Amino acid sequence: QIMELQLFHKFAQNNPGMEHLGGVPKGGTFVLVYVDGRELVRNLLSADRDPTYQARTEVIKKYASLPPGSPQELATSRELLNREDIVVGDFCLPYRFSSKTPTVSYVLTQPRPI
Amino acid sequence: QIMELQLFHKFAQNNPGMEHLGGVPKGGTFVLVYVDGRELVRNLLSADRDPTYQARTEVIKKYASLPPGSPQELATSRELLNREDIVVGDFCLPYRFSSKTPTVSYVLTQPRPI
């Protein structure tokens, strides 16, 4: 059960109601969604190697400043040669998980026709 | 003797005259020069990993085309994960540093009386 429930995007079939609002409510859960493959990642990252695409940060930084961060995080984030996976999206869901008090399923049968 | 004579760049002490022209004269000798190590290679290849460096290929391809190559060769060259040595320099010499064959020196038989 664990191999399939908590790993596939066919996890919504057990927990329907996922939506994209760009964040998380106070007390909800935040779901990241990714893919795999080296050739696929190399194809998806193609736009971030263009000189005309990269020039954008210098156009922005004339007027507005960006949040700072530790140098090691920024150093790790710039090595694009050996990468196996990439984040594609995120979804919102408005409730936390119990995580205790084990579950016992209760089964009912449907009535017989006449 | 060849453990020392034919390995170190102090091979010039027996064959002086090495020079860098970026090529080889017709009938000369082409000498490659390399350096060993894991840490050296990881440090030296640091520029070929950054995308601002990698953009040069795409931008220059607007106007001129590069020589052809088979896809697997370029796929293998791109890995750079486990490499122990790297070529650093090149030199020329004006003669053959021959090997791999004996000589023949065709001659004729002598006039013995009959």
Short mmCIF file of N, CA, C and O in Angstrom, two decimals, chain A residues 42-94:
data_model
loop_
_atom_site.label_atom_id
_atom_site.label_comp_id
_atom_site.label_asym_id
_atom_site.label_seq_id
_atom_site.Cartn_x
_atom_site.Cartn_y
_atom_site.Cartn_z
N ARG A 42 17.20 17.69 -19.05
CA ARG A 42 18.07 18.51 -19.90
C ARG A 42 17.25 19.26 -20.94
O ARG A 42 17.59 20.40 -21.30
N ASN A 43 16.18 18.65 -21.44
CA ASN A 43 15.33 19.36 -22.40
C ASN A 43 14.52 20.45 -21.71
O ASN A 43 14.30 21.52 -22.30
N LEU A 44 14.06 20.21 -20.49
CA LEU A 44 13.25 21.21 -19.80
C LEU A 44 14.08 22.41 -19.37
O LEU A 44 13.55 23.52 -19.31
N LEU A 45 15.35 22.21 -19.07
CA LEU A 45 16.20 23.31 -18.61
C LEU A 45 16.81 24.11 -19.75
O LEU A 45 17.71 24.91 -19.49
N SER A 46 16.37 23.91 -20.99
CA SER A 46 17.06 24.54 -22.11
C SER A 46 16.91 26.06 -22.10
O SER A 46 17.82 26.77 -22.52
N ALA A 47 15.77 26.57 -21.63
CA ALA A 47 15.54 28.01 -21.68
C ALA A 47 16.41 28.76 -20.69
O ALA A 47 16.66 29.95 -20.86
N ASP A 48 16.87 28.09 -19.63
CA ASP A 48 17.68 28.74 -18.61
C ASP A 48 19.16 28.80 -18.97
O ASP A 48 19.97 29.18 -18.12
N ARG A 49 19.54 28.42 -20.19
CA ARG A 49 20.90 28.56 -20.67
C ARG A 49 21.05 29.64 -21.73
O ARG A 49 22.16 29.89 -22.19
N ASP A 50 19.94 30.28 -22.10
CA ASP A 50 19.96 31.33 -23.11
C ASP A 50 20.49 32.64 -22.54
O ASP A 50 20.19 32.99 -21.40
N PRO A 51 21.28 33.37 -23.34
CA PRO A 51 21.86 34.65 -22.93
C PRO A 51 20.80 35.75 -22.85
O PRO A 51 20.87 36.62 -21.98
N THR A 52 19.81 35.69 -23.74
CA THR A 52 18.74 36.68 -23.76
C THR A 52 17.72 36.42 -22.67
O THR A 52 17.08 37.35 -22.18
N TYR A 53 17.55 35.16 -22.27
CA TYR A 53 16.69 34.84 -21.14
C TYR A 53 17.36 35.20 -19.82
O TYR A 53 16.69 35.62 -18.88
N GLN A 54 18.68 35.02 -19.73
CA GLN A 54 19.37 35.27 -18.47
C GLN A 54 19.52 36.76 -18.20
O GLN A 54 19.68 37.15 -17.04
N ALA A 55 19.51 37.59 -19.24
CA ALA A 55 19.68 39.02 -19.02
C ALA A 55 18.60 39.65 -18.15
O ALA A 55 18.74 40.81 -17.76
N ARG A 56 17.52 38.93 -17.83
CA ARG A 56 16.37 39.54 -17.20
C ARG A 56 16.67 40.03 -15.79
O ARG A 56 16.12 41.06 -15.35
N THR A 57 17.52 39.32 -15.05
CA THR A 57 17.76 39.71 -13.67
C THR A 57 18.43 41.07 -13.58
O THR A 57 18.14 41.84 -12.65
N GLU A 58 19.29 41.41 -14.54
CA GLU A 58 19.95 42.70 -14.50
C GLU A 58 19.00 43.83 -14.87
O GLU A 58 19.15 44.95 -14.38
N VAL A 59 18.03 43.56 -15.74
CA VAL A 59 17.00 44.55 -16.03
C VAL A 59 16.16 44.81 -14.79
O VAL A 59 15.79 45.95 -14.50
N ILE A 60 15.84 43.76 -14.04
CA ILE A 60 15.04 43.96 -12.84
C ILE A 60 15.82 44.71 -11.77
O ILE A 60 15.31 45.65 -11.16
N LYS A 61 17.07 44.31 -11.52
CA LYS A 61 17.78 44.82 -10.35
C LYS A 61 18.12 46.30 -10.44
O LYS A 61 18.81 46.80 -9.54
N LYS A 62 17.69 47.01 -11.48
CA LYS A 62 17.89 48.45 -11.50
C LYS A 62 17.01 49.15 -10.48
O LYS A 62 17.42 50.16 -9.89
N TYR A 63 15.80 48.65 -10.26
CA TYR A 63 14.82 49.32 -9.43
C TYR A 63 14.45 48.58 -8.16
O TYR A 63 14.16 49.24 -7.16
N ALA A 64 14.48 47.26 -8.16
CA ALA A 64 13.98 46.49 -7.03
C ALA A 64 15.02 45.47 -6.61
O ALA A 64 15.76 44.94 -7.43
N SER A 65 15.07 45.21 -5.31
CA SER A 65 16.04 44.28 -4.76
C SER A 65 15.37 42.99 -4.33
O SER A 65 14.21 42.96 -3.92
N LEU A 66 16.12 41.92 -4.41
CA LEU A 66 15.70 40.55 -4.22
C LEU A 66 16.09 40.06 -2.84
O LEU A 66 17.00 40.62 -2.21
N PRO A 67 15.44 39.02 -2.32
CA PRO A 67 15.79 38.53 -1.00
C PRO A 67 17.19 37.93 -1.02
O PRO A 67 17.61 37.31 -2.01
N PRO A 68 17.94 38.10 0.06
CA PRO A 68 19.27 37.50 0.13
C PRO A 68 19.18 36.07 0.64
O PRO A 68 18.16 35.63 1.17
N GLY A 69 20.29 35.35 0.50
CA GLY A 69 20.34 33.97 0.93
C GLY A 69 21.77 33.55 1.13
O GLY A 69 22.71 34.18 0.64
N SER A 70 21.93 32.46 1.87
CA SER A 70 23.26 31.97 2.19
C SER A 70 23.99 31.59 0.90
O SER A 70 23.37 31.13 -0.06
N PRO A 71 25.31 31.79 0.84
CA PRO A 71 26.03 31.54 -0.42
C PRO A 71 26.07 30.08 -0.83
O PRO A 71 26.17 29.79 -2.03
N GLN A 72 25.98 29.14 0.11
CA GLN A 72 26.07 27.73 -0.27
C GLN A 72 24.82 27.27 -1.00
O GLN A 72 24.91 26.47 -1.93
N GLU A 73 23.66 27.84 -0.66
CA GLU A 73 22.41 27.47 -1.29
C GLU A 73 22.46 27.90 -2.74
O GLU A 73 22.13 27.14 -3.65
N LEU A 74 22.88 29.15 -2.94
CA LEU A 74 23.00 29.69 -4.28
C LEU A 74 24.06 28.95 -5.08
O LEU A 74 23.91 28.75 -6.29
N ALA A 75 25.14 28.51 -4.43
CA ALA A 75 26.18 27.78 -5.14
C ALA A 75 25.68 26.42 -5.60
O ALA A 75 25.95 26.01 -6.73
N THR A 76 24.95 25.72 -4.74
CA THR A 76 24.42 24.42 -5.12
C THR A 76 23.38 24.55 -6.23
O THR A 76 23.31 23.70 -7.12
N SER A 77 22.58 25.61 -6.19
CA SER A 77 21.50 25.73 -7.17
C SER A 77 21.98 26.03 -8.58
O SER A 77 21.17 25.95 -9.51
N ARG A 78 23.26 26.35 -8.78
CA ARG A 78 23.72 26.75 -10.10
C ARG A 78 24.37 25.62 -10.90
O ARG A 78 24.74 25.85 -12.06
N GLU A 79 24.52 24.43 -10.33
CA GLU A 79 25.18 23.32 -11.01
C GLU A 79 24.12 22.50 -11.75
O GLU A 79 23.46 21.65 -11.15
N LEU A 80 23.98 22.75 -13.04
CA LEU A 80 22.92 22.13 -13.84
C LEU A 80 23.38 20.90 -14.61
O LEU A 80 22.61 20.39 -15.43
N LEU A 81 24.61 20.43 -14.40
CA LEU A 81 25.12 19.37 -15.26
C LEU A 81 24.60 18.00 -14.86
O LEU A 81 24.23 17.20 -15.72
N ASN A 82 24.57 17.70 -13.56
CA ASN A 82 24.22 16.37 -13.08
C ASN A 82 22.94 16.46 -12.24
O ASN A 82 22.99 16.50 -11.01
N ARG A 83 21.80 16.45 -12.92
CA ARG A 83 20.51 16.55 -12.25
C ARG A 83 19.55 15.52 -12.82
O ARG A 83 19.45 15.37 -14.04
N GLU A 84 18.85 14.82 -11.92
CA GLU A 84 17.98 13.71 -12.29
C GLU A 84 16.50 14.04 -12.23
O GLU A 84 15.70 13.33 -12.84
N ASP A 85 16.11 15.09 -11.51
CA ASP A 85 14.70 15.36 -11.27
C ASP A 85 14.49 16.86 -11.18
O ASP A 85 15.42 17.63 -10.95
N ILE A 86 13.23 17.28 -11.33
CA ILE A 86 12.90 18.69 -11.41
C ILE A 86 11.47 18.88 -10.93
O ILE A 86 10.58 18.09 -11.24
N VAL A 87 11.24 19.93 -10.14
CA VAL A 87 9.91 20.22 -9.63
C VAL A 87 9.11 20.94 -10.71
O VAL A 87 9.60 21.88 -11.33
N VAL A 88 7.88 20.50 -10.92
CA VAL A 88 7.01 21.07 -11.94
C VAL A 88 5.87 21.87 -11.34
O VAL A 88 5.50 22.92 -11.86
N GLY A 89 5.27 21.41 -10.24
CA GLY A 89 4.13 22.16 -9.75
C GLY A 89 3.89 21.99 -8.27
O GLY A 89 4.61 21.25 -7.58
N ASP A 90 2.88 22.69 -7.77
CA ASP A 90 2.44 22.53 -6.39
C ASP A 90 0.93 22.68 -6.31
O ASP A 90 0.32 23.36 -7.14
N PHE A 91 0.35 22.06 -5.29
CA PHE A 91 -1.09 22.06 -5.07
C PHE A 91 -1.37 22.28 -3.59
O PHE A 91 -0.53 22.02 -2.73
N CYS A 92 -2.57 22.76 -3.32
CA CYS A 92 -3.03 23.07 -1.97
C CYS A 92 -4.02 22.01 -1.51
O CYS A 92 -4.71 21.40 -2.32
N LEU A 93 -4.07 21.77 -0.20
CA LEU A 93 -5.12 20.87 0.28
C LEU A 93 -5.44 21.19 1.74
O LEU A 93 -4.54 21.26 2.57
N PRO A 94 -6.71 21.43 2.08
CA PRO A 94 -7.06 22.15 3.31
C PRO A 94 -7.25 21.32 4.58
O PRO A 94 -8.23 21.50 5.31
#
